[PDB]
Design a protein around this ligand. Structure first.
Ligand SMILES: *[C@@H]1O[C@H](CO[C@@H]2O[C@@H](C)[C@@H](O)[C@@H](O)[C@@H]2O)[C@@H](O[C@@H]2O[C@H](CO)[C@@H](O)[C@H](O)[C@H]2NC(C)=O)[C@H](O)[C@H]1NC(C)=O
Ligand SMILES: *[C@@H]1O[C@H](CO[C@@H]2O[C@@H](C)[C@@H](O)[C@@H](O)[C@@H]2O)[C@@H](O[C@@H]2O[C@H](CO)[C@@H](O)[C@H](O)[C@H]2NC(C)=O)[C@H](O)[C@H]1NC(C)=O
Ligand SMILES: *[C@@H]1O[C@H](CO[C@@H]2O[C@@H](C)[C@@H](O)[C@@H](O)[C@@H]2O)[C@@H](O[C@@H]2O[C@H](CO)[C@@H](O)[C@H](O)[C@H]2NC(C)=O)[C@H](O)[C@H]1NC(C)=O
Ligand SMILES: *[C@@H]1O[C@H](CO[C@@H]2O[C@@H](C)[C@@H](O)[C@@H](O)[C@@H]2O)[C@@H](O[C@@H]2O[C@H](CO)[C@@H](O)[C@H](O)[C@H]2NC(C)=O)[C@H](O)[C@H]1NC(C)=O
Ligand SMILES: *[C@@H]1O[C@H](CO[C@@H]2O[C@@H](C)[C@@H](O)[C@@H](O)[C@@H]2O)[C@@H](O[C@@H]2O[C@H](CO)[C@@H](O)[C@H](O)[C@H]2NC(C)=O)[C@H](O)[C@H]1NC(C)=O
Ligand SMILES: *[C@@H]1O[C@H](CO[C@@H]2O[C@@H](C)[C@@H](O)[C@@H](O)[C@@H]2O)[C@@H](O[C@@H]2O[C@H](CO)[C@@H](O)[C@H](O)[C@H]2NC(C)=O)[C@H](O)[C@H]1NC(C)=O
Ligand SMILES: *[C@@H]1O[C@H](CO[C@@H]2O[C@@H](C)[C@@H](O)[C@@H](O)[C@@H]2O)[C@@H](O[C@@H]2O[C@H](CO)[C@@H](O)[C@H](O)[C@H]2NC(C)=O)[C@H](O)[C@H]1NC(C)=O
Ligand SMILES: *[C@@H]1O[C@H](CO[C@@H]2O[C@@H](C)[C@@H](O)[C@@H](O)[C@@H]2O)[C@@H](O[C@@H]2O[C@H](CO)[C@@H](O)[C@H](O)[C@H]2NC(C)=O)[C@H](O)[C@H]1NC(C)=O
Ligand SMILES: CO[C@@H]([C@@H]1OC(C(=O)O)=C[C@H](NC(=N)N)[C@H]1NC(C)=O)[C@H](O)CO
Ligand SMILES: CO[C@@H]([C@@H]1OC(C(=O)O)=C[C@H](NC(=N)N)[C@H]1NC(C)=O)[C@H](O)CO
Ligand SMILES: CO[C@@H]([C@@H]1OC(C(=O)O)=C[C@H](NC(=N)N)[C@H]1NC(C)=O)[C@H](O)CO
Ligand SMILES: CO[C@@H]([C@@H]1OC(C(=O)O)=C[C@H](NC(=N)N)[C@H]1NC(C)=O)[C@H](O)CO
Ligand SMILES: [Ca+2]
Ligand SMILES: [Ca+2]
Ligand SMILES: [Ca+2]
Ligand SMILES: [Ca+2]
Ligand SMILES: [Ca+2]
Lengths: 388, 388, 388, 388
């Protein structure tokens, strides 16, 4: 017997440490590795797992040509051992999907899988391996979700979903799902948040989600949610913004609305509230998906004249490609440990990655209440060595 | 301790949703994938699995040349994770077989495996990994079975078997098997059914099988069976027929006999009775194994002047190759969820598939009581990219 | 908790049926498959497994050249799913070995692994994954063992071992081993048996072993053994002999001594006593390792003028290569089911197998109390398709 | 429920026997095998495992060029079945690491993983799959650890760590870690030990570590440790030294200080105290990493005029390459069995290994209280057959 996962507080932490790294592109030089993008990490009672949206092709084969394309019927959510490269011998196929979320409720895995035509997609809800429910696109405009783990509290899982324009007002919802059955949804209040996609969520008593505003916000929207309702919304106050693109530091302190500067498009990213402070992941570049650093901003969660970057860990150099990043948690004794992954995108459309495909590798970090050292953990592939 | 699977009713449903897709041909471009055909899906308490008849060769190797051939000693029933491509690193070999059925009784797996000479074949019964019984060909003419999951109720499994001509009167039997031991068989009554092969079965209190008449019927034969006997037989009443080949819609309402129009040969297919209505899978083409759609026919299960196609979901476009299809069930709370798979055949003898081999990929769908969206989930391989 | 395996009687049977087939050479065309020889099968409570002596090389690679050689330091006993081809992604390495035996006692696996110099070999005893004991060569002349499963009764396993000349008087021993610890050994009486190697054993209340006389016997030596001592020895009475080479049928009824005709060398083979009758596997050829058939000889176990071949099943045609064969058992309700495997050798030194390597595939059969059909299940590889 | 591993005595033994061998380089001829170095073995309740530091590349691919390099961000500790070659289909990634140790406490696995810049590395402590603690480099000079299994007693694991110069005075510490939490550390006394790296440890009531002095000692430093403190330190008294390089036999009896002859650099090696005697592994060459033998020195653990090599087993000939070696233990009834592995390095910088990469295979041996035979179990690869 296993109890449902509980609403624990986040563990104390003061820095992030290298965890798992898959080196998937390097290891894919001989065409063994499945083409992927939009990876994430989620854990059950026994194991942490890598998930990603596969492209139904092996890296460097003719079918991998043109995999920059976001949505095809040949994309599936796949799962593979954390820190391993995805190969035909080690992967599991979870569901057909070109957008997804996964989370473990303490007893079973739930997954949310979107597929189908852009104007008539549906999300399949999978629970314990069985398709238990679905969501039909209601705005008929690329129904889509987190691309990282959802969160479950006392048996009820919450997941954020969007349907509507990429660069104009869209519909944003939170769905509450219990043992695979949709219990209710709420439209996210638009009093503060103006655009929301690709939420990265974690648990700190309540569920906290830090997301992507693809329209007018260079600052990230956020929500605080419990097993019943949305409790609070906003944008991260930090005058040091963390979307890409974004303005140079420092920019506007915008707690209650999108910055309206360098607002579109964006990249999936994450953060962790820590008291009144906030930790924010971001690309090193303000314009491109290169480099990765995590900053701690003093009083960055609140409206304050005192924001300062008290810590910056540079984890992937700006000479290296990054991509999406997202939060995941690991249960400690009586708290959840904050961790994250970084997607390291190689191939199109990255300048000088002269191959026809698009894929990624993964690196991950976890928070501890200790001082970290320093290093650089980029993809590491010599693109000139790769089959094109 | 695990109880035997019970005679539950079918869950309510109003449409079908994309579940798992293996993209096996696409992923086999570099010769990693085992050549297969006649795939199906069946689930135990912990996992749903892909099964297929392998050809004892890897796709695109010299030994894959000529795998259009149906029966060889080098064919085995293999099992692999659902939605994954079959590779040497992930498959299990169940038994030697060029025709098969598999089902889980709640405690253990049973399999039925036919192999040997066309005029002296035998079916091996495997239960919990052990060969427990057998059936010797009695008509000496290609003893053969479902090519999809059998069904087990209260510990007794039922499976349909045929021996005799492909295009004339043959012998059709149902076998009842308990913990791997044959308990009894019955010759299927020939009062209505005139030819029967490749039954696709599910449980809705009783076992229902919808099969292939390869001789005179463009409509599909069916049986209703319990743990003791055959209860009822017929052909699906729907004036919209679902074998391939078949006449244009609408054709004859033939509840009690083969249509006698476009009667031979056929393709394995499936259906689900829903009250007085019926859902029927079929190729989009009336002549060839291209496309796949599922239709709901109002009052299509009964003798009625009111048959109408109330729903048509097009799941594989007529510009894409399909093949066999079959039912499987997944246990919900107190009902069984209806699901199906579609075999997507590539290679010989498909026009313009210029390769020497014959194989397939798989796509699957499950029924929910929700409205579906729409899409297209074909094999997706560019045959020109493949080793020949 | 699992009890030790008990001394059950052999199940009734009247014919043998195709079980698992790995098609390993066919599937090794693209160099994925590990080079092996001397395979066998043994089962635990949950699974039957293939075992074989690997050669530390992949089929068709440069390191596979010259693998006809019997003993090297690069040979290991490996285990892989029954009926699958051995690949790097699915195998387990059990121990370093150029001769081996394995058996499951109901709780744990025991293995016997010989390796080292021809004149100073040692056998390592492995139990539950731990090296628990050893046997040092005492005749300093290729200490060697069964190359098929040993047998365990009430927690005590018995295994036959030989040290000494291949074609002159040698030493033959049975070792009794309990939870991996050698309890005792006995020198096999030489009152009847004059040479003994490669015993194929099964349980029918007591352990019965049918072996290979490599010196003067075209008939096979046998032993009956319990958990404490050797009870009986002899040669199989059947005037239809079953070693290879051997005389044409009928030859001598030699219950108590080697035939002294076509006596050397031999091939590993097996048999099953059934009342006063005996079932014997053999190559179809009297001179070479081609073809495979199993015969039932009426009163073939005893001294009788009435020996007749009442049944012959031809399982591999004489146009196809065979090799070693051995018995294994599978627990039924209150009896053990007799099964066997046949090694299908391809490569050197087989005439017209124009490759530099030597390897094998496997086919298996089990006994049932039903009448079998007929067929042919040879290796199936086109040697001209293979990397050399 | 599983109890913590207990402080058992070492089993009696009088020789070492071949256990598992992976033949990884031979099997990597077709580019399937992951590039590794610094392998070791460690066991849990169910299985013994191979561990190694991967290089994030497949053997013989372009990314394998230059893998002689010791520390990169693309190195991970990986785990794979003992005696198998590491491939993408069978490996697990444990953590990012260019130096590591692993051990099982009876309930869960602990790992110590160093990565990052040479002057700012950190060690991540992993327990039951979760990152639980860390150690920050304090001398800022290649924080590093055992490269073989640590040892755990009554739930407290001990591991030796070094930070500082390779060929001058450095800092050496033992860390005590319980359920992944650092409890305390001690600086190793420098009264006797002058330089210490790469400890090979085992349990004989207390933990004993035999290490590498890379500075002035051709004799090996050692420590005796319990769950609370360092109890004793020294250098192995044996006048037959066992580092590489080292002087010809016999050299100095140096129980309390480095020999000061042929003192730098060294190789990781191991030993086992047996009463007043000692068993020591060593390369056959006094200058290079070729060959492997294990010697027993009478009274070699103590200060005595009576040291004599009473036994020498030659396990890898001096015509073959060796490398690192280390101890591991396997639980017997009421004692621990002493075992070891030998790393067989192929590629750069080995003379005449004309390839651009550096990797290894593994061979292992276990101690029994029986007399061994003899043999030779080298890597076995023909380097001329390998992709460069
Ligand atoms: C939602 O969960 C609560 C229990 O969690 C608490 O309340 C949440 C809203 C959130 O604040 C958490 O951090 C809290 O820990 C459930 O409330 C329980 O309901 C049962 C049945 O009525 C009752 O017996 C318990 O006493 C309640 N516990 C508390 C503290 O009120 C509630 O049922 C959950 N709601 C749903 C829709 O499942
Ligand atoms: C990646 O693919 C492109 C496009 O391939 C072409 O169109 C595809 C849909 C498919 O039908 C292919 O068979 C076609 O070749 C390749 O670009 C083409 O290259 C060919 C050959 O040099 C050239 O004749 C065409 O003009 C190109 N077409 C376009 C649209 O630019 C490209 O070469 C592939 N990249 C690699 C590394 O193979
Ligand atoms: C077959 O199953 C029945 C139980 O299932 C019921 O009857 C079936 C024929 C079918 O109608 C199902 O939908 C029903 O749920 C077994 O009948 C039981 O037998 C035992 C022993 O005699 C008796 O104690 C129970 O009361 C019976 N149950 C009922 C409802 O009659 C029957 O034994 C099964 N037959 C075989 C051959 O196994
Ligand atoms: C697929 O195989 C056919 C047939 O192969 C021939 O017969 C087989 C049984 C086997 O013995 C092969 O070695 C033979 O080559 C191939 O068709 C043959 O092609 C060859 C070479 O071009 C030609 O000489 C023959 O006339 C052809 N034979 C027939 C019956 O048509 C065919 O090329 C193979 N396809 C591919 C893609 O390799
Ligand atoms: C060997 O096994 C017997 C039990 O098996 C029986 O005797 C064998 C020799 C063989 O004939 C089998 O087919 C039989 O089933 C053990 O005998 C038992 O010993 C215990 C302890 O003394 C005693 O309590 C039981 O009554 C005995 N059983 C019988 C039937 O005698 C014997 O201990 C085993 N010997 C060894 C060395 O383990
Ligand atoms: C299989 O190997 C043989 C022998 O290979 C030679 O000796 C080996 C031990 C190793 O050192 C190899 O590098 C050697 O080439 C091959 O037979 C040799 O072939 C070569 C090249 O044609 C020729 O020069 C030699 O005379 C041959 N030597 C002998 C002893 O006959 C053989 O070609 C290999 N087979 C295949 C299919 O590659
Ligand atoms: C360390 O372990 C001891 C138990 O192990 C014994 O003492 C070790 C130092 C070493 O000598 C081993 O070989 C011995 O077997 C723990 O001592 C126990 O502590 C508890 C709580 O106080 C007490 O109830 C027991 O009686 C103690 N046992 C003995 C024999 O003294 C000790 O707690 C461990 N220390 C740590 C830090 O965990
Ligand atoms: C192993 O790699 C070396 C070095 O490769 C060069 O530098 C690397 C960092 C990378 O940028 C490669 O693309 C470079 O080629 C190879 O040595 C070089 O070989 C090339 C081609 O012959 C030659 O032009 C250079 O002078 C060489 N450079 C050096 C530093 O010596 C070497 O060939 C590779 N080995 C193998 C077996 O491929
Ligand atoms: C369409 O672009 C959206 C997503 O963008 C990106 C990215 O690399 O920026 C990857 C996704 N790829 C997939 N998840 N497959 C997209 N999301 C989808 C649904 O296409 C964006 O958020 C605007 O709506
Ligand atoms: C012989 O043809 C039968 C089966 O047909 C087909 C198909 O693609 O139409 C595949 C099978 N392939 C295998 N199951 N291997 C055949 N069935 C067999 C037993 O050959 C048909 O149903 C008439 O009897
Ligand atoms: C040496 O020949 C013996 C074994 O023979 C054969 C065979 O194919 O005939 C395979 C073995 N191969 C291995 N088990 N590796 C040999 N047995 C050994 C130990 O070499 C024979 O039984 C005479 O003693
Ligand atoms: C730097 O050299 C150290 C280690 O040396 C060696 C070896 O082959 O001699 C392998 C290691 N490789 C790795 N563990 N990766 C090194 N150790 C490290 C940390 O580099 C040496 O002990 C001196 O400090
Ligand atoms: Ca390959
Ligand atoms: Ca933005
Ligand atoms: Ca028909
Ligand atoms: Ca003979
Ligand atoms: Ca030294």
């Amino acid at each position: 017997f296993r109890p449902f996962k509980s609403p624990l507080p986040l563990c104390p932490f003061r820095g992030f440490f290298p965890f798992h790294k898959d080196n998937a592109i390097r290891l894919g030089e001989n065409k063994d590795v499945i083409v992927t993008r939009e990876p994430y990490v989620s854990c059950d009672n026994d194991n942490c797992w890598s998930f990603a949206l596969a492209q139904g092709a092996l890296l460097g084969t003719k079918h991998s040509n043109g995999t920059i394309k976001d949505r095809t019927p040949y994309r599936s959510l796949i799962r593979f051992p954390i820190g391993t490269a995805p190969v035909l011998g080690n992967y599991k196929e979870i569901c057909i999907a070109w957008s997804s979320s996964s989370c473990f409720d303490g007893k079973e895995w739930m997954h949310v899988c979107m597929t189908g035509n852009d104007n008539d997609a549906s999300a399949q809800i999978i629970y314990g391996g069985r398709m238990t429910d679905s969501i039909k696109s209601w705005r008929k405009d690329i129904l889509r979700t987190q691309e990282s783990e959802c969160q479950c509290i006392d048996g009820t899982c919450v997941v954020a979903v969007t349907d509507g324009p990429a660069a104009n007002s869209a519909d944003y919802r939170v769905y509450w799902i219990r043992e695979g059955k949709i219990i209710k949804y709420e439209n996210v209040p638009k009093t503060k948040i103006q655009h929301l996609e690709e939420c990265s969520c974690y648990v700190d008593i309540d569920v906290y989600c830090i997301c992507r505003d693809n329209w007018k916000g260079s600052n990230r929207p956020w929500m605080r949610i419990n097993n019943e309702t949305i409790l609070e919304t906003g944008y991260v106050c930090s005058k040091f913004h963390s979307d890409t693109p974004r303005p140079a530091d420092p920019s506007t302190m915008s707690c209650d609305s999108p910055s309206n500067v360098n607002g579109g498009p964006g990249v999936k990213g994450f953060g962790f509230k820590a008291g009144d402070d906030v930790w924010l992941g971001r690309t090193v570049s303000t314009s491109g998906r290169s480099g990765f650093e995590i900053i701690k901003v003093t009083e960055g969660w609140i409206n304050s004249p005192n924001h300062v970057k008290s810590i910056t860990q540079t984890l992937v150099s700006n000479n290296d490609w990054s991509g999406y990043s997202g939060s995941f948690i690991v249960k400690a004794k009586d708290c959840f440990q904050p961790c994250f992954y970084v997607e390291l995108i190689r191939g199109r459309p990255n300048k000088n990655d002269d191959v026809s495909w698009t894929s990624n590798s993964i690196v991950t970090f976890c928070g501890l209440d200790n001082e970290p050292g320093s290093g650089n953990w980029p993809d590491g592939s010599n693109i000139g060595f790769m089959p094109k």
